[PDB]
Write a protein that holds these residues in place. Structure first.
Motif, PDB file in Angstrom:
ATOM      1  N   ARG A  27     -16.281 -64.953 -24.718  1.00 51.98           N
ATOM      2  CA  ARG A  27     -15.678 -64.398 -25.781  1.00 51.98           C
ATOM      3  C   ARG A  27     -14.612 -63.500 -25.406  1.00 51.98           C
ATOM      4  O   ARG A  27     -14.288 -62.904 -24.613  1.00 51.98           O
ATOM      5  CB  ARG A  27     -16.702 -63.683 -26.349  1.00 51.98           C
ATOM      6  CG  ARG A  27     -16.183 -62.655 -27.597  1.00 51.98           C
ATOM      7  CD  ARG A  27     -17.211 -62.224 -28.393  1.00 51.98           C
ATOM      8  NE  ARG A  27     -16.860 -61.239 -29.536  1.00 51.98           N
ATOM      9  CZ  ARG A  27     -16.184 -61.630 -30.599  1.00 51.98           C
ATOM     10  NH1 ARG A  27     -16.074 -63.030 -31.024  1.00 51.98           N
ATOM     11  NH2 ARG A  27     -15.642 -60.926 -31.381  1.00 51.98           N
ATOM     12  N   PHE A  28     -13.375 -63.727 -25.871  1.00 52.15           N
ATOM     13  CA  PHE A  28     -11.950 -63.058 -25.643  1.00 52.15           C
ATOM     14  C   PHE A  28     -11.972 -62.172 -26.792  1.00 52.15           C
ATOM     15  O   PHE A  28     -11.385 -62.142 -27.569  1.00 52.15           O
ATOM     16  CB  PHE A  28     -10.967 -64.237 -25.669  1.00 52.15           C
ATOM     17  CG  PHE A  28      -9.639 -63.605 -25.211  1.00 52.15           C
ATOM     18  CD1 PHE A  28      -9.730 -63.152 -23.840  1.00 52.15           C
ATOM     19  CD2 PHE A  28      -8.303 -63.445 -25.825  1.00 52.15           C
ATOM     20  CE1 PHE A  28      -8.422 -62.616 -23.132  1.00 52.15           C
ATOM     21  CE2 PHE A  28      -7.200 -63.173 -25.222  1.00 52.15           C
ATOM     22  CZ  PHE A  28      -7.228 -62.589 -24.173  1.00 52.15           C
ATOM     23  N   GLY A  29     -12.704 -61.074 -26.542  1.00 54.34           N
ATOM     24  CA  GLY A  29     -13.014 -59.838 -27.349  1.00 54.34           C
ATOM     25  C   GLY A  29     -11.829 -59.310 -27.843  1.00 54.34           C
ATOM     26  O   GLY A  29     -10.675 -59.627 -27.342  1.00 54.34           O
ATOM     27  N   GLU A  30     -11.949 -58.516 -28.836  1.00 57.21           N
ATOM     28  CA  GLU A  30     -11.000 -57.636 -29.468  1.00 57.21           C
ATOM     29  C   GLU A  30      -9.954 -56.718 -28.551  1.00 57.21           C
ATOM     30  O   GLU A  30      -8.944 -57.110 -28.512  1.00 57.21           O
ATOM     31  CB  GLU A  30     -11.362 -56.683 -30.477  1.00 57.21           C
ATOM     32  CG  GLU A  30     -10.546 -55.912 -31.399  1.00 57.21           C
ATOM     33  CD  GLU A  30     -10.883 -55.236 -32.413  1.00 57.21           C
ATOM     34  OE1 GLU A  30     -12.053 -55.048 -32.318  1.00 57.21           O
ATOM     35  OE2 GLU A  30     -10.064 -54.801 -33.454  1.00 57.21           O
ATOM     36  N   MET A  31     -10.650 -56.201 -27.698  1.00 54.82           N
ATOM     37  CA  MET A  31      -9.893 -55.185 -27.028  1.00 54.82           C
ATOM     38  C   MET A  31      -9.026 -55.947 -25.546  1.00 54.82           C
ATOM     39  O   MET A  31      -7.991 -55.812 -25.235  1.00 54.82           O
ATOM     40  CB  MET A  31     -11.117 -54.429 -25.897  1.00 54.82           C
ATOM     41  CG  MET A  31     -11.669 -53.231 -26.805  1.00 54.82           C
ATOM     42  SD  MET A  31     -12.783 -52.280 -25.930  1.00 54.82           S
ATOM     43  CE  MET A  31     -13.225 -51.415 -27.069  1.00 54.82           C
ATOM     44  N   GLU A  32      -9.613 -57.319 -25.151  1.00 53.99           N
ATOM     45  CA  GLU A  32      -8.760 -58.223 -24.530  1.00 53.99           C
ATOM     46  C   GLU A  32      -7.579 -58.543 -25.303  1.00 53.99           C
ATOM     47  O   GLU A  32      -6.465 -58.434 -24.577  1.00 53.99           O
ATOM     48  CB  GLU A  32      -9.709 -59.386 -23.994  1.00 53.99           C
ATOM     49  CG  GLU A  32     -10.770 -59.031 -23.032  1.00 53.99           C
ATOM     50  CD  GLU A  32     -11.957 -58.465 -23.739  1.00 53.99           C
ATOM     51  OE1 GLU A  32     -12.260 -58.677 -24.890  1.00 53.99           O
ATOM     52  OE2 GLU A  32     -12.856 -58.119 -22.978  1.00 53.99           O
ATOM     53  N   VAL A  33      -7.622 -58.671 -26.547  1.00 52.98           N
ATOM     54  CA  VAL A  33      -6.475 -59.070 -27.197  1.00 52.98           C
ATOM     55  C   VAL A  33      -5.519 -57.971 -27.345  1.00 52.98           C
ATOM     56  O   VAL A  33      -4.233 -58.230 -27.097  1.00 52.98           O
ATOM     57  CB  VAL A  33      -6.811 -59.417 -28.902  1.00 52.98           C
ATOM     58  CG1 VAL A  33      -5.614 -59.489 -29.625  1.00 52.98           C
ATOM     59  CG2 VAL A  33      -7.496 -60.878 -28.744  1.00 52.98           C
ATOM     60  N   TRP A  34      -5.993 -56.758 -27.638  1.00 52.29           N
ATOM     61  CA  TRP A  34      -5.166 -55.488 -27.389  1.00 52.29           C
ATOM     62  C   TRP A  34      -4.572 -55.440 -25.877  1.00 52.29           C
ATOM     63  O   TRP A  34      -3.205 -55.665 -25.695  1.00 52.29           O
ATOM     64  CB  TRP A  34      -5.831 -54.258 -27.478  1.00 52.29           C
ATOM     65  CG  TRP A  34      -6.325 -54.097 -28.718  1.00 52.29           C
ATOM     66  CD1 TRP A  34      -6.194 -54.780 -29.958  1.00 52.29           C
ATOM     67  CD2 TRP A  34      -7.375 -53.236 -29.010  1.00 52.29           C
ATOM     68  NE1 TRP A  34      -7.023 -54.373 -30.992  1.00 52.29           N
ATOM     69  CE2 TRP A  34      -7.714 -53.469 -30.480  1.00 52.29           C
ATOM     70  CE3 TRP A  34      -8.280 -52.367 -28.440  1.00 52.29           C
ATOM     71  CZ2 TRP A  34      -8.810 -52.462 -31.147  1.00 52.29           C
ATOM     72  CZ3 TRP A  34      -9.286 -51.491 -28.884  1.00 52.29           C
ATOM     73  CH2 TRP A  34      -9.470 -51.662 -30.354  1.00 52.29           C
ATOM     74  N   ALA A  35      -5.077 -55.597 -25.059  1.00 49.34           N
ATOM     75  CA  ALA A  35      -4.820 -55.743 -23.555  1.00 49.34           C
ATOM     76  C   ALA A  35      -3.445 -56.785 -23.307  1.00 49.34           C
ATOM     77  O   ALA A  35      -2.419 -56.309 -22.867  1.00 49.34           O
ATOM     78  CB  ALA A  35      -5.657 -56.025 -22.571  1.00 49.34           C
ATOM     79  N   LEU A  36      -3.823 -57.924 -23.749  1.00 51.15           N
ATOM     80  CA  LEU A  36      -2.778 -59.027 -23.552  1.00 51.15           C
ATOM     81  C   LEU A  36      -1.531 -58.621 -24.366  1.00 51.15           C
ATOM     82  O   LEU A  36      -0.125 -58.838 -24.116  1.00 51.15           O
ATOM     83  CB  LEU A  36      -3.166 -60.402 -24.196  1.00 51.15           C
ATOM     84  CG  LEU A  36      -3.693 -61.515 -22.958  1.00 51.15           C
ATOM     85  CD1 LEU A  36      -4.240 -62.616 -23.532  1.00 51.15           C
ATOM     86  CD2 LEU A  36      -2.710 -61.645 -22.018  1.00 51.15           C
ATOM     87  N   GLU A  37      -1.662 -58.076 -25.887  1.00 53.27           N
ATOM     88  CA  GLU A  37      -0.616 -57.448 -26.348  1.00 53.27           C
ATOM     89  C   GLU A  37       0.222 -56.686 -25.854  1.00 53.27           C
ATOM     90  O   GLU A  37       1.306 -56.297 -25.918  1.00 53.27           O
ATOM     91  CB  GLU A  37      -1.063 -57.071 -27.721  1.00 53.27           C
ATOM     92  CG  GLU A  37      -1.438 -58.276 -28.873  1.00 53.27           C
ATOM     93  CD  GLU A  37      -1.895 -57.527 -30.052  1.00 53.27           C
ATOM     94  OE1 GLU A  37      -0.968 -56.715 -30.684  1.00 53.27           O
ATOM     95  OE2 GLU A  37      -2.892 -57.947 -30.629  1.00 53.27           O
ATOM     96  N   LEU A  49      -6.009 -68.307 -28.591  1.00 53.15           N
ATOM     97  CA  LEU A  49      -6.740 -67.953 -29.928  1.00 53.15           C
ATOM     98  C   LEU A  49      -6.043 -69.121 -31.043  1.00 53.15           C
ATOM     99  O   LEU A  49      -6.318 -68.830 -32.089  1.00 53.15           O
ATOM    100  CB  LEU A  49      -6.692 -66.538 -30.534  1.00 53.15           C
ATOM    101  CG  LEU A  49      -5.574 -65.924 -30.962  1.00 53.15           C
ATOM    102  CD1 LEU A  49      -4.827 -66.337 -31.905  1.00 53.15           C
ATOM    103  CD2 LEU A  49      -5.637 -64.327 -30.914  1.00 53.15           C
TER     104      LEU A  49
END
Ligand SMILES: [Mg+2]
Ligand SMILES: [Zn+2]
Ligand SMILES: [Zn+2]
Lengths: 99, 79, 1337
Positions: A27-37, A49
């Motif tokens: 699961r590419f969780g929410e916090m990981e999306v923040w990190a990539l941004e 995604l």
RNA sequence: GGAGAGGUA
């Protein structure tokens, strides 16, 4: 220890299943999306995604390209977003995409 | 092989358009039938593109002008 | 393709337009033949076929018959994907009311129709009546009636007036109204009468009414007549494989509502008595309420297990809703998970990878290579070969891996460094090997942590990984420049044990010919690893213009240090590896190496550091034993003496000589003293016990005791743990915050008995529970923060402004908590600084203050610098490059097109788990004294007595740079004057902080004017001494007699007239406040500045949460609203009145004061705006509206930075300034001018700014705005883009409001672009978005 | 597919 490349798919929303019992993916969780941004990384997030989990035609064409040794993608639009659109339209709200 | 990208960033001082220029070059190299300007040592296309960028014999503007020139010849290739 | 998302209401006609059929039967599946029903909730004739290109009956079953329909089924032979996109529509026999537009708080129906919600609640559930027109009779438009009242009214008035009951009545009433005409009437009425609360009410109602007319929505569409149905496949009927089906509650609610609908249809057909139809319509209304949103009504409904079902509104809200579950973060293919081990033989830019995971992740690439090489002429044969892995595939796999990065991620990934790229190296194991240096960045212990592996597929993803996230590019933490790959805990011990010196070791005093000679000597075993020795070394210095100059010398060091020098790169001074090399020294060494020699030398040097550290630590054999915990020999004597000391005080309190509280406090104090003595004795006997002869008689050195060697070096544990291991372990606190009077007098080398262990257990459990709750809360804090700053992206090159802020070193009363050189390091200047050779321009006005300029500032002792800050940049929809400063994660200015809001939010949220949840001025440095805001006189003793409140004293060193600051209370006596010299340790001032005097200004006689005993005051003559004493009766204390008069005291002379104030013409009479105790007599001489009379007087994570949320404090320190004189008025209506009168302007401002506020000023004093009227916390809102923006930002940054640095965590200021800039973003219009904005509109700051800026180009006059501060929780919701708000909390409210307003989102943030699934306008995607804008426009 | 319980970091 567990791995997954291309397995089953959930029913209501086309995303890979979850858990080791089924052959599910992580699961590419929410916090990981923040990190990539936080990096300048944008292409990796967009593919991660759009074409690796959700956009059905996108991932079929991605598999074809990868087998043919030509790395690219055809993003399209996530299916889960269409699910949200229909679900929110099931109330009285009329929501749509403009020009 | 590459471990850093520091000198390449020095040649192209943004670290973002670096990604796009290197990607376009590697795309020319992988699916397109082009050839490298630097000897290859069993290295993949991304690293070869970065190495080419490093020596400064390919950047964004020269890539664009080369594309324009080859497209002009292609327009002249039909006669 | 598309560019915007539009949202509005759906008229019944449009709903019919969507639908592809009508549902009429509550039946779904036969349970014997798994075909659908005739036209039930599922169906084929309505939604579509069940199998691809398959008619249901089987008359046609081939794609050749596409398009045609069956003549018996009517189904459309086509794909089955249609079964996920067609929608049905139910027909409702009775009109019904949408629940969302009824109990939304506020309720749109309630205030559009302007009826109290109670009455609409009664009407809509069939327990009353409401008139519709009610004309030509006694009744009004919309009077409510009880049942009996309606019967009576129609009896007396059987004429045509209509009074209906329920949804139909509401629909008629709404449809029977004109909007814009009502708007005209309401604006006319709002013109005046009255602007107290009706102003707010009518403004809100007019806002809604003009919202309808602005949009294309008729009011009556809020009453549902036709109800759509979700497609079938989005609510699939999963079988349980036990011959039955699962719950799938949505279909349950649908069948329920359809049953009610059919019941009502029949009863309406058969003309039953009105009671039955009313009951059934009520039931139908409840069914629809349940379907649209279950729970908001008084009682939810359940099928079993006493758990409510999932209404449609429950499939969007909450963590389980789409937005936060399947739309922002998805599961993902091409992934894996495993446990991690150390494997310290890896370079810094690679990580191990098990064979099996590698062969399972990369499978498509293996297929590609096999087919390219012609070893399998299809995908089935290739899949077979991979399945049984003939030996060939392993070399192919190694071939694929060559230069293909992967991403490693850990579960609670707080900050940007939590997800990092790597190269893979195949390992014959089953655990992901991880380089041991990055464990600090991951905060990843090896006690069972699991990590997840992803692979980037496309080409651009590979290049992005390599050029942004490869581990050799993240060395400096984004929070602050400090390195983040500091050698952590074992290599540091090795190095510290390597660079030491025993006073007399083997082979001491010889001379060597360079490092490698020393290395050979040590390995041959002729000289111990550390012994003093002269060795010749060749340093390199590049002080020239980038030219390395070699210089040799003959240093005196120890063979350990000489061996270590062989590792370091060329250009570093030798003295960097000459000290003991603790942890701090290693961190500094790395930092200097990076700041001198770029990057690549630093990374290679760090790797070599790790290798040598591990090797020599292993050689050391530094083990821990039970003999290496020395108990000081005086512990027992100390504790016994403390015991006797306690006993004597116990005896004292036995005889009543002392009180309980003092006994308790003295016991605690003496126990603390004993504890400190024991700790000191233990440490002194531990750190130097080594006494060894130096080839002569005797000497002592730093000890080699293992525990001390681990603690001092910084590997593990501070001195507190050593105290707890050797000395007594302090005093333990019982649960309710009290401290037990009996400490624990037993360390751990000895054993704790029962009770001591019990108490320690309580303490430990408190700690554990606190960590759990604290992390739980910090997660929510960070999630809120990143959702108010996610849309900010540096998007220009230079805004071109001049306003900044004054950066200065921070003072707290004591020393400097933070110098100047660490607050402006890497922020561009605003106005070029002038050296203190004034008119000497030291720096240009727009240069980056990197290290060299910082040195130039330091040597010239600069004091305060104007620095451009991100809170005032004039770019719209983003900030300009220069305003931000230095990237702080790589040594150069920020690149155009970078997401800074997210990194700031994460950097502030990451340390959130390390926080805790629950006289006389003594100048201490020689230097000149300066006073700011002095309004003083000379008292009788020749000292200086101050008559102002904002007087502040600064002690400045000989240079002329401030070094200390102190707050001077009012009426405080000062030995010095101004510009004197103070000796160190001198007490410079004193005051009486307990009681407040009535200090005068000049000598003369003091006359008690309007001071009458009996009804104005009380003659409470002093009884213990007998001097004159009279106490002013407060307004409460006095009777009616003295209420009118105002006691005062005017300075007079022998002539008797009122001596005037020096300078001005206002006669000096001081207004005596209530409860003022006086001791002097009438007409008695007194001198200047004398006491005329006397009148007596959290820090945890919640502090940060409250401060950012901008919550009003408990006891607001009310401020001075404007400038001018002040006066009183009406009194004792439970509170006092205050009025303020400017010098010449109007004086409208009056305010209420709760009686318990100690107003420091008197009426006859003139006060300028921004001066405290009471004491207490200062709310941010008034700070903003009074002292502008550059005050609230400074206050916020100072307070938060205090709360952080008190716990020893470093965060650069920019990360807080950006949050504040995103917080203060809404503006309110005072004057429209030639603009279009209504008077009271709250408009986005950017819109008004651009409108005024462009209008002034013409001859128009712009609008006037007043900035407003909203807590983040309210700021993120009031955003133009409503998808961002919806993905945040409370979707229901924002969604209904947006739907009514008919908003239109345009996809500019970093979040909605994630939802839709296109490139972000943040990083590499910025170029694409730039071109996209420049093309369409 | 959804609930409940336990466990790891
Ligand atoms: Mg752990
Ligand atoms: Zn048929
Ligand atoms: Zn700017």
């Amino acid at each position: 220890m567990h791995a997954r490349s291309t397995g089953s798919y959930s029913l209501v929303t086309q995303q890979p299943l979850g858990g080791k019992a089924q052959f599910g993916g992580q699961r590419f969780g929410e916090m990981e999306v923040w990190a990539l941004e936080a990096y300048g990384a944008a292409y990796t997030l967009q593919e991660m995604l759009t074409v690796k989990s959700d956009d059905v035609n996108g991932r079929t064409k991605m598999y074809k390209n990868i087998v043919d040794g030509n790395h690219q993608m055809e993003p399209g639009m996530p299916e889960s977003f269409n699910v949200l659109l229909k679900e929110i339209r099931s109330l009285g709200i009329n929501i749509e995409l403009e020009d | 092989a590459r471990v850093t990208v520091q000198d390449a960033v020095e040649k192209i001082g943004n670290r973002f358009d670096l990604v796009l220029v290197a990607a376009r070059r590697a795309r020319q190299m992988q699916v397109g039938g082009k050839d490298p300007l630097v000897p290859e040592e069993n290295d993949k296309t991304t690293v070869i593109a970065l190495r080419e960028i490093e020596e400064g014999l390919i950047n964004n503007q020269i890539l664009d002008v080369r594309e324009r020139q080859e497209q002009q010849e292609q327009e002249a290739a039909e006669l | 393709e598309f560019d915007a998302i539009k949202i509005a209401l759906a008229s019944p006609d449009m709903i019919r337009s969507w639908s592809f059929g009508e549902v009429k039967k509550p039946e779904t599946i036969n349970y014997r033949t798994f075909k659908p029903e005739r036209d039930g909730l599922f169906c084929a004739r309505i939604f579509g076929p069940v199998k691809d290109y398959e008619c249901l009956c089987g008359k046609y079953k081939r794609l050749k018959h596409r398009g045609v329909i069956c003549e018996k089924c009517g189904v459309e032979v086509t794909q089955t994907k249609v079964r996920r996109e067609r929608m049905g529509h139910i027909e409702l026999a009775s009109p019904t009311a949408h629940i969302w537009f009824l109990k939304s708080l506020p309720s749109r129906i309630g205030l559009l129709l302007d009826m109290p919600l109670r009455d609409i609640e009664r009407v809509l559930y069939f327990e009353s009546y409401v008139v519709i027109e009610g004309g030509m009779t006694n009744l009004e438009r919309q009077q409510i009636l009880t049942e009996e009242q309606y019967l009576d009214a129609l009896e007396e008035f059987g004429d045509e007036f209509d009074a209906k009951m329920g949804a139909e009545a509401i629909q008629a009433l709404l449809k029977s109204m004109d909007l814009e005409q009502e708007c005209e009437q309401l604006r006319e009425e709002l013109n005046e009468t009255n602007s107290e609360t009706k102003r707010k009410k009518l403004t809100k109602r007019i806002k809604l009414l003009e919202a309808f007319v602005q949009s294309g929505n008729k009011p009556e569409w809020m009453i549902l007549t036709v109800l759509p149905v979700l497609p079938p496949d989005l609510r699939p009927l999963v079988p349980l494989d036990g011959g039955r089906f699962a719950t799938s509650d949505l279909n349950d609610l649908y069948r329920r509502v359809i049953n009610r609908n059919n019941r009502l249809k029949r009863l309406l057909d058969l003309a039953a008595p009105d009671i039955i139809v009313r009951n059934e319509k009520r039931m139908l209304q409840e069914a629809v309420d349940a379907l649209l949103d279950n729970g908001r009504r008084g009682r939810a409904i359940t099928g079993s297990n006493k758990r409510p079902l999932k209404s449609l509104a429950d499939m969007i809200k909450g963590k389980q809703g789409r937005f936060r579950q399947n739309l922002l973060g998805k599961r993902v293919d091409y992934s894996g998970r495993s446990v991690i081990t150390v494997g310290p033989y890896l370079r810094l830019h690679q990580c191990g990878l098990p064979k099996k995971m590698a062969l399972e992740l990369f499978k498509p690439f293996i297929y590609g290579k096999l087919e390219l090489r012609g070893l399998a002429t299809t995908i089935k044969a290739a899949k077979k070969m991979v399945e049984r892995e003939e030996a060939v595939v392993w070399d192919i796999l190694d071939e694929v891996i060559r230069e293909h990065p992967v991403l490693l991620n850990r579960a609670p990934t707080l900050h940007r460094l939590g997800i990092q790229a790597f190269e893979p190296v195949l390992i014959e194991g089953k655990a992901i090997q991880l380089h041991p240096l990055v464990c600090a960045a991951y905060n990843a212990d090896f006690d069972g942590d699991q990590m997840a592996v992803h692979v980037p597929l496309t080409l651009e993803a590979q290049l992005e990984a390599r050029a942004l996230m490869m581990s050799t590019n993240n060395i400096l933490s984004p929070a602050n420049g400090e390195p983040i790959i500091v050698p952590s805990q074992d290599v540091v011990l090795g190095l510290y044990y390597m660079t030491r010196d025993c006073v007399n070791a083997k082979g001491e005093g010889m001379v060597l010919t360079g490092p490698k000679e020393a290395e050979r000597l040590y390995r041959s075993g002729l000289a111990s690893l550390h012994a003093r020795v002269k060795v010749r070394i060749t340093e390199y210095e590049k002080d020239a213009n980038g030219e390395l100059v070699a210089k040799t010398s003959l240093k005196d060091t120890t063979v350990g240090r000489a061996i270590l020098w062989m590792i370091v790169p060329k250009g570093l001074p030798y003295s960097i590896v000459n000290q003991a090399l603790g942890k701090k020294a290693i961190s500094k060494m790395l930092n200097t190496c990076y700041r001198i020699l770029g990057l690549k030398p630093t990374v290679i040097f760090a790797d070599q550091i790790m290798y040598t550290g591990f090797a020599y630590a292993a050689r050391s054999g530094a083990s821990v034993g039970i003999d290496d915990m020395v108990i000081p020999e005086k512990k027992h004597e100390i504790i016994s003496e403390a015991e006797a000391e306690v006993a004597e005080i116990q005896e004292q309190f036995q005889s009543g000589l002392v009180t309980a509280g003092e006994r308790y406090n003295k016991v605690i104090d003496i126990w603390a003293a004993a504890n400190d003595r024991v700790s000191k004795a233990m440490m002194d006997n531990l750190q130097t016990e080594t006494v060894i002869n130096r080839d002569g008689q005797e000497e002592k050195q730093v000890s080699f005791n293992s525990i001390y060697m681990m603690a001092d070096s910084g590997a593990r544990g501070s001195a507190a743990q050593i105290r707890q291991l050797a000395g007594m372990r302090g005093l333990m606190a019982k649960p309710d915050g009290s401290i037990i009077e009996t400490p624990i007098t037993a360390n751990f080398r000895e054993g704790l008995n029962v009770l001591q262990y019990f108490i320690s257990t309580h303490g430990a459990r408190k700690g554990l529970a606190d960590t759990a709750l604290k992390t739980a809360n910090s997660g929510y804090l960070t999630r809120r923060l990143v959702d108010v700053a996610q849309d900010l992206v540096v998007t220009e090159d230079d805004c071109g402004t001049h306003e900044g802020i004054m950066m200065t070193p921070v003072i707290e009363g004591g020393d400097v908590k933070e110098p100047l050189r660490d607050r402006v390091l890497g922020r561009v200047t605003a106005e070029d600084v002038l050296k203190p050779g004034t008119a000497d321009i030291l720096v240009p006005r727009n240069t980056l203050l990197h290290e060299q300029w910082c040195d130039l500032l330091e040597e010239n002792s600069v004091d305060a610098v104007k620095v451009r800050s991100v809170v005032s940049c004039d770019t719209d929809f983003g900030v300009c490059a220069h305003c931000y400063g230095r990237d702080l994660a790589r040594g150069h200015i920020i690149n155009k097109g970078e997401a800074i809001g997210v990194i700031a939010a994460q950097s502030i949220g990451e340390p959130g788990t390390q926080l805790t949840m629950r006289s006389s001025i003594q100048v201490k440095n020689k230097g000149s004294i300066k006073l700011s805001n002095v309004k003083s006189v000379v008292n009788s003793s020749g000292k200086l007595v101050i008559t102002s409140r904002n007087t502040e004293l600064k002690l400045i060193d000989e240079f002329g740079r401030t070094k200390e600051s102190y707050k001077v209370p009012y009426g405080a006596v000062l030995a010095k004057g101004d510009g004197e010299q103070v000796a160190g340790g001198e007490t410079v001032a004193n005051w009486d902080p307990h009681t407040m005097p009535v200090i005068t200004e000049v000598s003369g006689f003091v006359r008690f004017t309007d001071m009458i005993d009996g009804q104005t005051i009380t003659r409470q003559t002093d009884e213990l001494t007998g001097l004159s004493s009279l106490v002013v009766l407060d307004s409460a204390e006095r009777t009616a007699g003295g209420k009118d008069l105002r006691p005062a005291l005017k300075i007079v002379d022998a002539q008797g007239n009122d001596v005037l104030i020096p300078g001005t013409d206002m006669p000096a009479q001081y207004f005596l406040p209530g409860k003022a105790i006086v001791q002097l007599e009438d007409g008695v001489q007194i001198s200047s500045g004398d006491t005329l009379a006397r009148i007596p007087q959290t820090g945890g994570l919640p502090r940060v949460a409250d401060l950012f949320e901008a919550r009003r404090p408990k006891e607001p320190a009310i401020l001075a609203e404007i400038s001018g004189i002040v006066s009183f008025g009406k009194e004792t209506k439970g509170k006092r009145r205050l009025v303020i009168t400017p010098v010449d302007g109007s004086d409208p401002y009056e305010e209420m004061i709760p009686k318990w506020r100690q107003l420091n000023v008197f009426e006859g004093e003139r006060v300028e705006r921004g001066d405290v009227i009471s004491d207490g916390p200062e709310a941010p809102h008034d700070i903003l509206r009074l002292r502008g923006v550059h005050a609230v930002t400074r206050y916020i940054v100072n307070e938060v930075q205090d709360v952080y640095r008190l716990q020893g965590v470093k965060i650069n200021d920019k990360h807080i300034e950006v949050i504040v800039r995103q917080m203060l973003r809404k503006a309110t219009i005072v004057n429209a001018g030639s603009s279009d904005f209504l008077e009271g509109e709250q408009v986005e700051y950017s819109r008004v700014k651009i409108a005024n800026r462009e209008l002034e180009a013409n001859g128009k006059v712009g609008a006037t705005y007043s900035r407003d501060l909203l807590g983040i929780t309210k700021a993120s919701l009031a955003t133009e883009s409503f998808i961002s708000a919806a993905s945040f909390q409370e979707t229901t409210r924002v969604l209904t409001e947006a739907a009514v307003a008919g908003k239109r989102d345009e996809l500019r943030g970093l979040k909605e672009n994630v939802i839709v699934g296109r490139l972000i306008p943040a990083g590499t995607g910025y170029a694409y978005h730039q071109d996209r804008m420049r093309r369409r426009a």
